[PDB]
């Protein structure tokens, strides 16, 4: 027996995306992380929901959180639109002066327009916050996963500020619209007040509840992946690498299909939307939503890890017998790994290697082969493959039952 093998096989990607901080850029990550979340409903594993979720899916522990973070990004969207003909319908300031009762009526009613969404937000960030997210989502505390750590308390709070003083606002933009709708100088001041709410609404940021309505969406998806996203199931392997406001960097390892895991891709989308919207909500933070935007790069990393082991075979063909792998740890005995018996080929593996190790052989050409993936430190030995010409009943998984042994090859 002849032991082939090597190199330990090591992809790192790295994306580097370069994109602005435009809201409608933002909406469309925090779209895809809540959609192909909602979508797919993947089932999950000091948590709460840890205990119940654990076999069963996310969309029945957090059917209403998704719901509620859909809204919100879906109303920040209808946020962001009509603030987007609001610009170019400010109320300018012959007698031609007609289009100014509409673009008065437009500007107005669109402002009107822009609160009532932002209390369908805020009333869905409480459908959010307020279920098994209660006291996690909110605050930020080696590792920094459970906490949603977005800052939301931050937003909702200023959201808040910012919605009550536009309701202090309300009965004078509410008579600045019937005194507007006589259609067959008292409105010359509702256009610079107008056209100067409005120049407030979709130019301000600490004082706009268009922008801290949508920065409340952003985050809150921020959040909502972090106070969760580490016990979707996903998933050959990859490496998913992520990092945490205070400096720690994690990774995340990952049949797949609808209401049990996500594949691969769909966590790659996920990891990719997550960085970015990280990535610009931390730093340059959200433009104004008159804004063009601002250029800034995410970067986004992967990586897979594999090794195969090959065997072949001098003597006969142990493709109806047993073939085998053995692992010897510095110094000690020879343990078992993986073993592919009789003709029909059955496998059995291992407790360390289940999910992770895999056993297979080409019966023509006599040699029998081990990928290994998810690779770590704990393995790292010597590795034996061991056959066995002689019949058997049981599987045979203990060194002193296999015959034949290869010289053996190191492993790192």
């Known amino acids: 027996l002849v032991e082939s093998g090597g190199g330990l096989v090591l992809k790192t990607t790295t994306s580097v995306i370069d994109t602005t901080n435009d809201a409608q850029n933002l909406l469309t990550q925090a779209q895809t992380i809540v959609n192909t979340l909602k979508d797919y409903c993947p089932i999950l594993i000091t948590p709460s929901w840890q205990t119940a979720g654990g076999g069963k899916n996310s969309c029945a522990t957090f059917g209403a959180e998704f719901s509620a973070a859909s809204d919100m990004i879906n109303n920040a969207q209808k946020i962001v639109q009509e603030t987007q003909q609001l610009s170019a319908n400010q109320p300018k300031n012959p007698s031609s002066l007609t289009a100014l009762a509409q673009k008065m009526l437009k500007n107005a009613q669109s402002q009107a327009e822009i609160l009532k969404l932002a209390n369908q937000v805020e009333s869905d960030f409480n459908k959010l916050s307020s279920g098994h997210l209660k006291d996690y989502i909110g605050k930020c505390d080696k590792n920094n996963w459970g906490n949603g750590c977005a800052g939301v308390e931050e937003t909702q709070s200023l959201l808040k500020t910012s919605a009550a003083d536009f309701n202090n606002q309300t009965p004078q933009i509410n008579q600045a619209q019937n005194l507007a709708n006589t259609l067959i100088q008292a409105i010359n001041q509702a256009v610079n007040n107008l056209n100067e709410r409005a120049k407030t609404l979709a130019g301000g940021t600490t004082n706009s509840p268009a922008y801290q309505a949508t920065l409340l969406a952003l985050r809150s998806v921020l959040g909502l992946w972090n106070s969760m996203g580490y016990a979707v199931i996903c998933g050959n392997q990859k490496d998913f690498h992520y990092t945490d406001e205070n400096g720690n960097g994690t990774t995340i390892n990952c049949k797949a299909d609808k209401n049990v895991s996500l594949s691969i891709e769909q966590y790659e989308k996920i990891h990719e939307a997550y960085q970015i919207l990280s990535k610009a909500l931390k730093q340059a933070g959200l433009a104004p939503l008159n804004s063009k935007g601002e250029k800034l790069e995410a970067h986004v990393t992967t990586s897979k890890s594999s090794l195969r082991l090959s065997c072949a075979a001098s003597?006969?063909?142990?493709?109806?017998?047993?073939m085998g792998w053995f692992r010897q740890a510095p110094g000690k005995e020879r343990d078992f790994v993986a073993g592919?018996?009789?003709?029909?080929?059955?496998?059995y593996y291992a407790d360390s290697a289940k999910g992770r190790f895999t056993i297979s052989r080409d019966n023509a050409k006599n040699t029998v082969y081990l990928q290994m993936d998810s690779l770590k430190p704990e393995d790292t030995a010597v590795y034996y493959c061991?056959?066995?010409?002689?019949?058997?009943?049981?599987?045979?998984?203990?060194?002193?039952?296999?015959?034949?042994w290869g010289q053996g090859t190191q492993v790192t």
């Open positions: 061991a056959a066995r010409r002689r019949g058997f009943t049981l599987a045979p998984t203990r060194a002193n039952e296999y015959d034949y």
């Open positions: 003597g006969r063909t142990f493709s109806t017998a047993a």
């Open positions: 592919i018996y009789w003709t029909v080929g059955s496998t």
